[PDB]
Design a protein around this ligand. Structure first.
Ligand SMILES: O=c1[nH]ccc2oc(-c3cccc(C(F)(F)F)c3)cc12
Ligand SMILES: O=c1[nH]ccc2oc(-c3cccc(C(F)(F)F)c3)cc12
Ligand SMILES: O=c1[nH]ccc2oc(-c3cccc(C(F)(F)F)c3)cc12
Ligand SMILES: O=c1[nH]ccc2oc(-c3cccc(C(F)(F)F)c3)cc12
Lengths: 121, 121, 121, 121
């Protein structure tokens, strides 16, 4: 609430989240454009009693890249903070782990960053 | 199932998780001391239909470090895979974001790696 | 140059680097944040024969945060790629490890992302 | 400093390094079977005046995966600390960036961890 609603990253993904009063994040992450085949469940957690000192609100969530259509055998977690105000943002770093054999585990995890805005690009 | 159970990391943290038929992860994360003040909710997702080629099962979860007793204004995400068989393990890397001001955002996020076993370390 | 030149990140740190014919990076780094004063030595490596397919040029470098003035007992590595163009950029992610006791090792390493251009924000 | 010499990671790689009086790390990194084709230049930095409170020694280094024989168009940086004493260790986290097109940049960077010892695994 501040967090609840629709967010857009800088690469074409959208998600919709509900931030519950108990610290829950629940919603849907859509990897592209608009199609059902590109929508996935997301769940996570956030600090439901953040500071009001100019600090962001810590949070994180997961998407496992399986839906009824597709399965990439991988999951992303985003860890970051919500920054409110007129130009609100969710600033994140993420980890994308694929299921691998033990021989390939060294190359199982990508890292990157995403910034989400409320304003549809 | 494989995933469902009680896991421990190398620093004794206790991760009590249930893997639901839908890809859901739910449970609690706590200290080796086992006190209520050290116990926090988690939620996450896993690949409920992993590959059949020997690969692990991708998964992730989040803990926001607030409970009824304490608030660190912080959240951790773990991204990793479950590896089944002879001795089951969950290998992860994690991101811990604390709320910061914008000027301090460059130092908001720690990274590390945790390995979980069904035995204590 | 290409890579050789004076670059600035989104915080205004100054990265003065020379790319040698032998694949070496050498130069100085001056930070806009943290326990840092004046310049610090850097060294690194870059791909001196990048792909010709439109991909960027992979590179990395290290700064240990000790100079003749101050010592923060820590080191940052930046891993990334140079992207040529009308506004050339070096896009990185970085790891900042501090020397810690073993008890504190779990919190030894910060992660982030820096973007460098030849223009100071 | 305790750093100069040959180090081995968990997975078959060998680190030969000299820690100079100027805070420089210089050497080679071999992925190998043990052969010249598997050997790559490394350079980095370390804290040459670490804390005396029992903390480790911060360091980092880079290898670009090009030698006279091959070129993976990628570079790894290791960020970590040397822990001395009876069973000395270099504990690291690493970032491997490949040169990519901008469309592929989200999948440019792998993350992981390596532990180096004085004796072979
Ligand atoms: O918007 C994002 N931000 C950070 C990471 C990330 O990964 C994806 C993504 C979406 C669909 C499939 C897959 C893969 F790789 F096949 F598993 C990954 C989207 C996205
Ligand atoms: O088992 C772990 N593995 C990775 C990260 C991590 O953080 C904690 C932890 C627990 C309580 C509070 C806090 C803090 F920092 F104040 F936010 C962190 C446990 C744990
Ligand atoms: O420009 C940057 N980009 C990414 C990381 C980073 O760290 C520093 C930095 C500079 C001086 C001291 C320290 C600390 F924390 F005390 F060790 C860190 C600058 C900088
Ligand atoms: O020992 C290690 N520890 C962490 C990372 C890492 O990457 C390599 C490595 C070696 C040769 C080629 C390549 C690639 F992928 F083609 F660029 C990577 C070795 C190594």
């Amino acid at each position: 609430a501040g967090i609840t609603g629709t967010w857009y990253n800088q690469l074409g993904s959208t998600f919709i989240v509900t931030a519950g009063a108990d610290g829950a994040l629940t919603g849907t992450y859509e990897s592209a454009v608009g199609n059902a085949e590109s929508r996935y469940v997301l769940t996570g957690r956030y600090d439901s009693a953040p500071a009001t000192d100019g600090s962001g609100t810590a949070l994180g969530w997961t998407v496992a890249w399986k839906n009824n259509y597709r399965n990439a055998h991988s999951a992303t977690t985003w860890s970051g903070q919500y920054v409110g105000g007129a130009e609100a943002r969710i600033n994140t770093q993420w980890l994308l782990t694929s299921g691998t054999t033990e021989a390939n585990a060294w190359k199982s995890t990508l890292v990157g960053h995403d910034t989400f805005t409320k304003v549809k690009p």
